[model samples]
Target chain A: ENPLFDYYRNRQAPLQWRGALGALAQSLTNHFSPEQLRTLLREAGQHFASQHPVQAAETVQSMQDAMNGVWTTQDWGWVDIHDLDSFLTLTHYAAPLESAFGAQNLAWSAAFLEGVYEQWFRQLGASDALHVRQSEESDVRKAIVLRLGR
Target chain B: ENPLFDYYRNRQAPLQWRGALGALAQSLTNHFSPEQLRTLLREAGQHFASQHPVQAAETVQSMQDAMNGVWTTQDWGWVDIHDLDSFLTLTHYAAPLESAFGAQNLAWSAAFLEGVYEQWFRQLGASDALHVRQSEESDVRKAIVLRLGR
Candidate 1:
């Protein structure tokens, strides 16, 4: 027997969205090294930020509103950001990361989210020293955790 | 707004099961053409049937029991078999097939199930002329339907 998961049922996105993302992930994983995939996806994150420009002067809640607005429309799930004194801890909850990009690819595939957040923070006027990287051993079964700090 | 789905929640298998299948699907899609993938997966289905041999004299219900026994263990979902005189209709409900194989692969990916049922029926002593194929347009959003007939 294994651990029971009171898992979220409605985490999966539409077929078209999940299909395209799955194809991208599979293609990336096939040709690129893990580090390369991370690098490329981070650039994609920057490009994504360019498209959805949040105003330069917005409160944290407003920033969350902006991000959640996008996620809600895309069915990509939501994030919970906590100010942890030393660093801001971001836990992206309910995103179909595992299902969208097959679970085996999670090791590097998560960089897509890392890139998204990193660039979003850059747009929020955070210093370059404050970076985003996955915190803790990302259990593919649970929320994706990232830390932002020097 | 898009269509609302009263979708099944607990359809996904454990991480190990889903992960392995996802990897196999991704790899197969990467290397093979659609037809090749279908042919290969059908052989896999035959191999699977070989492993789980049903008794020659078993009734159709018992054959279902044997199949469901395997599916239950794999968390692959269940089937409802309807004998429609001209053909046997099998609706496999709540199999996370799209998620497990990525929706883009569904066109050819479903051939795996076609293969499985075909081989299973062969074990039940159905004539080789009686074959199985996906019956509907296979709106990957819903259940997988397969028809067993000439």
Candidate 2:
């Protein structure tokens, strides 16, 4: 029902956030590599971040606030920054892609998350820092652990 | 292959841990309430712990080690404690049942996690601590959030 997540709500219908994402996921699954998808999503993320008008002095705090806003609108999972080391760790709980695709033979969470992260760092005007297949690991509750380095 | 994950003696084939859990999940999907499955798993945990010979003096740490040992032996998702406040949150990544049954009208992770927690606490002689419903919201990732109370 929130306007941010109600991209497909007609006068006759309620919010379609999770449903739309699920439907969209089936089409996007394995359609591109994580890097390719992230590249595209970064542009969108810039647009999104710009709309929020985040102050440079409050980068961490603002991003945290932005994530909290995004979290309230979701119906499927959790996403958060883990460690802020030189090599960063991002922890995403209850990934939306799994719900988006219905069922899958392989884990598509990495590609899905890459899309988000790419957008995030790009909005911040940073170079890409994602490296997967080497440091990827599955944690409790179907959570995906992505280790990104500088 | 890491010996912790090698439950099989097969120099002839590749690792079979995740695959095994996947196959097992299909048959076990929607089979019982988490409480019931956990009741069954607790006895097994007790049997397993008995073999390890943990010290009684460091009950918490020793049990944690036993759990870590058990966790490493898993062929599927990772499980760990979260924000210990009399309630222990268990995280199991991958979630084979979601793969086993895709795009249903219900959430199956609750039942799945219930079984694991039941035994985990039972083996330690703790009271029931796990409580969840289908309506619980997402946390970090597609990570199944199971709120376990003391």
Candidate 3:
């Protein structure tokens, strides 16, 4: 009855995000059993490789790097958020990104996100003395205003 | 750090559910605009035609039927508890159901749910009788038992 439904009933859209999300939820519900998770990752990896190899490799590397760090329970929220976002984003962008940069870029981005997560964890333990000081700080209020405007 | 985290990280399962849910959410979010929903239904109808000729035809008929009936809502709480068992018995088999039917079945299921939501202004209006019946009687309990165990 809704006009939009009429359009959707006739059109086609890429289904990467849905595919990725379904995989993730299945993984979680299954309690992340190693065999199951591995199958998912490998299949996802191969899919990405075929569709977006470079980004796929990057994405995998990022995950590997994230795994290298000793992440506490406290760090999980961010890790989970980032992982989900990366997964969805990769799937959503699979076709275009692959067309533009090839599958490898997807691999690379995957790895990149993992590495970024690891870096985040490593920084968690840094005391003020060990922390790097910012030489030039951007105006927080301006950033917020810019974001809101968008 | 916990075993659960390790299990999830190392598991080798398919991400089917996650992908499905993600796709569902994205489809709902991106395509639910007044104009988009109309376009979406039209698009979905085409998809159904290619993927499910029988159901595609049925869908059109169902729409016509809906026009003749006064749409009404009912809560599951009012359904006789004994009948609930019948619903579960019929709809409890997701994997088997999909396996026996194929991806088109799943796609049609998704489309049907979306269609109902689109047709009714509210996601769970009284008019959403089919979904409500299917979801509550079959999907919900099956999912719960599958995840939690009897």
Task: Report candidate 3's fraction of native contacts.
Answer: 0.00
Worst 10 residues of 3 chain B by lDDT: B72-81
Worst 10 residues of 2 chain B by lDDT: B4-13
Off by over 4 Å in 2: A1-62, A74-76, A103-106, A125-135, A139-141, B1-150
Model 1 clash pairs are: none
Per-residue C-alpha lDDT of model 1 across residues A1-150, encoded as one tens digit per residue: 021122222225444456687898888878888889878867877787678776554666677777777765555657777777767888776656666776677777677788888888888888988899886676655678898888
Choose the strongest candidate by lDDT. Answer: 1
lDDT of each: 0.69, 0.44, 0.27
Chain B alone: TM-score in each candidate? 0.78, 0.49, 0.23
Candidate 2 chain A: worst-modelled 10 consecutive residues by lDDT: A4-13
When 2 and 3 are scored with DockQ, the better candidate is 3
Please provide, for model 3 over A1-150, each residue's C-alpha lDDT reduced to its tens digit, 9 standing for 90 to 100: 565643442221223222222222332323434444333333343332232222112444464344332222112112222233223111111112122122222332132223232233233431333221111234211110000000
Cand. 3: chain B TM-score: 0.23
TM-score of each: 0.49, 0.33, 0.23
Candidate 1 lDDT, B1-150, residue by residue in tens: 021122223224343455687798888778889999878878887787778665554565776777777775555667778878778888775566665676677787677788888888887779988889887666654668899988
Q: Is candidate 2 or candidate 3 better by TM-score?
A: 2
Better of 1 and 3 by lDDT: 1
DockQ winner between 1 and 3, please give it.
1
